[PDB]
Design a protein around this motif. Structure first.
Motif, mmCIF file in Angstrom:
data_model
loop_
_atom_site.group_PDB
_atom_site.id
_atom_site.type_symbol
_atom_site.label_atom_id
_atom_site.label_comp_id
_atom_site.label_asym_id
_atom_site.label_seq_id
_atom_site.Cartn_x
_atom_site.Cartn_y
_atom_site.Cartn_z
ATOM 1 N N UNK A 147 0.858 -1.179 0.000
ATOM 2 C CA UNK A 147 0.000 0.000 0.000
ATOM 3 C C UNK A 147 0.912 1.254 0.000
ATOM 4 N N UNK A 148 2.000 1.206 0.775
ATOM 5 C CA UNK A 148 2.942 2.361 0.841
ATOM 6 C C UNK A 148 3.640 2.565 -0.492
ATOM 7 N N UNK A 198 2.322 2.298 -3.363
ATOM 8 C CA UNK A 198 1.425 3.097 -4.169
ATOM 9 C C UNK A 198 1.443 4.538 -3.705
ATOM 10 N N UNK A 199 1.210 4.729 -2.415
ATOM 11 C CA UNK A 199 1.198 6.072 -1.873
ATOM 12 C C UNK A 199 2.511 6.824 -2.161
#
Ligand SMILES: NC(=O)c1ccc[n+]([C@@H]2O[C@H](COP(=O)([O-])OP(=O)(O)OC[C@H]3O[C@@H](n4cnc5c(N)ncnc54)[C@H](O)[C@@H]3O)[C@@H](O)[C@H]2O)c1
Ligand SMILES: NC(=O)c1ccc[n+]([C@@H]2O[C@H](COP(=O)([O-])OP(=O)(O)OC[C@H]3O[C@@H](n4cnc5c(N)ncnc54)[C@H](O)[C@@H]3O)[C@@H](O)[C@H]2O)c1
Ligand SMILES: NC(=O)c1ccc[n+]([C@@H]2O[C@H](COP(=O)([O-])OP(=O)(O)OC[C@H]3O[C@@H](n4cnc5c(N)ncnc54)[C@H](O)[C@@H]3O)[C@@H](O)[C@H]2O)c1
Ligand SMILES: NC(=O)c1ccc[n+]([C@@H]2O[C@H](COP(=O)([O-])OP(=O)(O)OC[C@H]3O[C@@H](n4cnc5c(N)ncnc54)[C@H](O)[C@@H]3O)[C@@H](O)[C@H]2O)c1
Ligand SMILES: Oc1cc(Cl)ccc1Oc1ccc(Cl)cc1Cl
Ligand SMILES: Oc1cc(Cl)ccc1Oc1ccc(Cl)cc1Cl
Ligand SMILES: Oc1cc(Cl)ccc1Oc1ccc(Cl)cc1Cl
Ligand SMILES: Oc1cc(Cl)ccc1Oc1ccc(Cl)cc1Cl
Lengths: 297, 297, 297, 297
Positions: free
Chosen positions: B201-202, B204-205
């Motif tokens: 997820x990180x 992507x962010x």
């Protein structure tokens, strides 16, 4: 010291009719990596393509990094909606274009390549077609929808199925898809979204079938809108180019080589552990959860 | 004619302590593509690593396709669970190992690289750690779980955050994840599954944050189990190697170079349109819907 | 003839401090279906909550379809960042709020419920907390990030782990997540995106662990922004409410009962075949591929 | 106090030919919730269905929780591969079965319902058909593949498109899909995997089109294999029932009501914030990353 080496490999690229699409770019990339290039050109487009190619109209587009020009070893007429001769309606057979050439059904083109070269290592599918693409799904006819599926999804199954016998094990195929298969993109109508979803699902299934059957890898690239920004974005693609530019994790346009380079990597031995995959080459758009240009922000 | 050209580029590889993991393989790949290699070695492992390297213990592992041997320009001690000196407990400071070296917090290592080379182009994160990995989540303690997250997910945020100022725009980073983040894999316990989900997820962010901030691309590779089959599969990894071999779309093992080659492509300019992505380099396992070896079949 | 029947079932709802969040709505829904309601209130909020409840401040919010008012059988103080008494710093122990009540660590609350009721059927987690939520990940500290994870992800593992022994088989738990775990949502900072990704991955893992261990189903609801539109959208949530309204497949706001109703279904026997799932209750936003309000269109 | 209330609502269920499939179960569920039930029966099956229904052959299957029996208000002959009369080949028109009844094209059935009841609130699609389902994709013909798509994916677009004009706003539709669309399931051949992928993608697209056009919600349920275990699993479905039982997060079979109950919830007002979704009602199988019964473990 780490080259994408395709020397001694042969690629059949289905879907090149000019130098402005992704098909041309993938061919350029494979040609830069050293592959021998065979092209499948849609019958109705065959003439202008071969002629422009002959008059040197695409010469600037054929320039490789190398400085040398890309060589297309042979252009094959092809209509991927027809598998075998008996499938063609005289209605079509009789059209001047189809009339002017031969051996264009999938089964025939495959036999010609076999006769001409005996084998290939790489299969690239870069074609799509959908008569009702401008209609919403609620307004698309059964024929229109099946036509999109037949030319844009089943054509891949047919090409792979017909070429499999002449593909050397350790070979690979690649197709091009688009995010409308997984997310709602208003304007990509007529069952084209449906067709891309089928193509991606078939990519997985065929990675298993062809993988276990002949050690062939099968992947698809979900590409972003191709081209630079319009002076005045009007039309589906122009607006999408602008939207992606404003909204992607990294602000830049997408050039055809960007996709061609990814494809070259994917069909090379360097990609040996990658199969049944959907690779996004879209500036990371697909990962965004909101449009940064929405007026609410 | 299509080389993955990293000449003139510099890479900092965090997580190399020997020649048997993915970290070593990525380094080899980048070194084959022409990059200058800097390594981050976990403090407690620093000694045996530098010594074996010195005694020529890894020489056979340093051989590049080229025939030449890989050069590690500099080894930096590092403990990615500590951001700055004031974060370290004297309890740790006082341990002989940590006692024997210095400048090992993330902030310090980054300043040393700046002082020593001024800039880098590529950041590779190839590290993880989880004290309670053998426990099911229902039996994992809060400390154990946070420890896994701190060393395996936040360490990436910290490295990127501390190195960003010295990364040349157009640069890239890559991390390694595993499918337990998205699907249930019994045996990958202690919050390690949780950590891999956070890392993805990180990724992507950070593709958005670093992309817009400095034109840096950020991706992660979801890799399969590394190694050939055991004479007698016992232990989590041995059994997984065998399971993947029997059940992947293409039956073969996964070798470290397979991952190293994908990473080299991903951090190169050829991958310019790819960011915030999770690329599977796992023989296509992740795509399978059933195990072909289940006794029901 | 098809009621969501929770009569004779008991639910412990962690995360209710007022009547404006999703926690209150889920409680209302479960109470309408017939469940006995136990509430876990964060220590610092305990006083104003119990007092407002007592003064009849939430009476209009307690009205069930039935016309009757919802009954909260018992409010339990709780701080889900602490598992056991020995985990609390005197620094915290000594704060007046924590000073004024007791039995608030997870282990203690679970023992009190056991002592008070012996068993429960449903566990609802509706809490989150992240001190650095307004910072981008590149600016979030290790402590801030771990704090978000500890309160927003591990707290679920702890509650389930501590309550599992008193949950009747065939029971269920549900948590609330948000799309920032899977897609980039600028503004949801401080590792909260990271925490939601861990919570969703843990939901899957725990569905297997608790499913095989006690026949307990575990799912999470990915909810949209809660509330009606602001006169002037300012602040993260206001702008998101407006964005979702303009851009979802169906244009409407999201009301808390909409989520409460889905949760009630998910924890009922009617949902017996559903576990390890992420259910989107967000007007279908997550499925959209482009913002319809982007100025390019 | 929380009933799935469909009283005063009317549902048209396409795909019921007996009491053993999911179609029958959804009808039972909707009938238990209070809906008026209209059924679409495939022409060739019409006779035995109506007759068995008449002889009381399905009476035990019609028993509602209520104790009362389900009432089918009207059975309509239907062949969802044909949109309008002019689409039917005399070859088909002339078959005795099609010969024996009328008004069975989609356009005709929709006009009959309009004439007979004026409007409906719920549309349920529970049908599929694929002549080459037992063939691998590499061996499926273009006609076989398009036939699967036409009956299993486009039929949904047609039904919704033809019924939309008589659907009351706030209404809903639901279809049934299967995981072969997203993951490789050997044995689900003939383009059926392709068809399910198209149906799921169309579900999303239609949630936007119908959502914005008439406030109709559109979702699909990805169901597990239906039935209890065979004495000797032989055949695709028997083996899948056994595999799911052994390998799901929760070990149990899947009964038709489990799916019928989820559908009833999804088409009710309680599900007002859910649209364009793929809901898994499969004991959580889809979330598993490895088969627990693989001999390697
Ligand atoms: N252009 C984009 O922005 C974009 C984005 C994502 C995906 N794609 C995909 O990339 C592929 C290439 O598209 P493009 O944009 O380069 O356009 P293009 O027109 O260059 O490519 C489509 C090609 O399909 C060929 N074709 C059509 N019908 C055919 C048939 N029956 N038989 C044989 N050939 C046929 C055409 O002659 C043409 O060369 C398509 O699959 C498209 O969906 C394009
Ligand atoms: N090995 C596999 O089969 C596999 C499969 C998927 C993903 N991965 C991932 O690949 C990466 C590399 O793993 P590997 O299998 O090559 O093992 P490895 O032991 O070679 O790599 C892990 C490394 O982390 C380092 N490390 C641990 N704690 C550290 C700390 N606090 N500070 C600095 N360095 C620390 C170790 O010293 C070690 O070099 C990990 O992220 C792992 O999760 C491995
Ligand atoms: N509000 C939204 O729009 C939205 C959207 C998606 C998801 N969610 C999720 O829904 C859940 C409920 O959020 P909400 O918006 O209803 O806000 P809320 O403030 O009503 O709920 C959060 C709750 O967490 C409690 N809490 C915080 N720290 C705690 C701790 N250490 N121990 C015990 N309790 C603690 C608070 O007291 C509060 O009741 C969260 O998980 C949130 O991420 C909310
Ligand atoms: N049975 C399972 O285990 C399972 C698992 C997942 C999904 N599904 C899906 O559930 C739906 C129902 O399948 P089922 O297993 O209940 O079987 P079924 O045979 O009860 O349902 C299929 C129905 O389609 C009807 N049908 C076929 N061709 C038709 C045509 N041209 N026109 C009109 N009706 C036609 C048949 O008459 C039949 O009633 C299908 O969409 C199937 O893919 C079933
Ligand atoms: O898939 C595409 C996606 C985009 Cl954004 C732009 C062009 C695309 O390509 C096509 C789309 C529809 C039809 Cl009928 C034919 C083609 Cl080649
Ligand atoms: O992620 C991995 C996945 C696999 Cl299949 C094998 C090894 C892996 O790597 C690790 C797993 C747990 C811990 Cl504690 C440390 C590391 Cl390096
Ligand atoms: O998850 C959420 C998502 C949205 Cl759109 C709005 C509120 C949310 O809830 C929170 C977000 C951050 C923190 Cl610190 C605490 C909570 Cl309760
Ligand atoms: O989708 C299905 C999935 C499973 Cl596991 C079992 C049955 C299914 O349903 C069908 C499958 C193929 C065809 Cl031709 C027709 C139908 Cl009704």
């Amino acid at each position: 010291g780490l080259p994408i080496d395709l020397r001694g490999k042969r690629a059949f690229i289905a879907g090149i009719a000019d130098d402005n699409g992704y098909g041309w770019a993938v061919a350029k990339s494979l040609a830069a990596a050293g592959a021998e290039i065979l092209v499948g050109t849609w019958v109705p487009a065959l003439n202008i393509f071969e002629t422009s190619l002959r008059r040197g109209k695409f010469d600037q587009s054929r320039v490789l990094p190398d400085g040398s020009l890309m060589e297309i070893k042979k252009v094959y007429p092809l209509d991927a909606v027809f598998d075998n001769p008996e499938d063609v309606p005289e209605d079509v057979k009789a059209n001047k274009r189809y009339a002017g050439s031969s051996n264009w059904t999938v089964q025939e083109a495959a036999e010609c390549v076999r006769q001409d070269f005996g084998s290939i290592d790489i299969l690239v599918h870069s074609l799509a077609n959908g008569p009702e693409v401008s209609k919403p799904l609620l307004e698309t006819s059964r024929k229109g929808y099946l036509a999109a599926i037949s030319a844009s999804s089943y054509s891949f199954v047919s090409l792979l199925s017909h070429f499999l016998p002449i593909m050397n094990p350790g070979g690979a195929s690649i197709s091009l898809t688009y995010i409308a298969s997984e997310r709602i993109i208003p304007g990509y109508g007529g069952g084209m979204s449906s067709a891309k979803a089928a193509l991606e699902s078939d990519t997985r299934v065929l990675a298993f079938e062809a993988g276990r059957k002949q050690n062939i890898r099968v992947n698809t690239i979900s590409a972003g809108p191709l081209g630079s920004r319009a002076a005045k974005a009007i039309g589906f693609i122009d607006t999408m180019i602008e939207y992606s530019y404003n909204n992607a994790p990294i602000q830049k346009t997408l050039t055809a080589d960007e996709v061609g380079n990814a494809a070259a990597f994917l069909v090379s031995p360097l990609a040996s552990a990658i199969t049944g995959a959907t690779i996004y080459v879209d500036n990371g758009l697909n990962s965004m959860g909101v449009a940064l240009d929405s007026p609410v922000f």
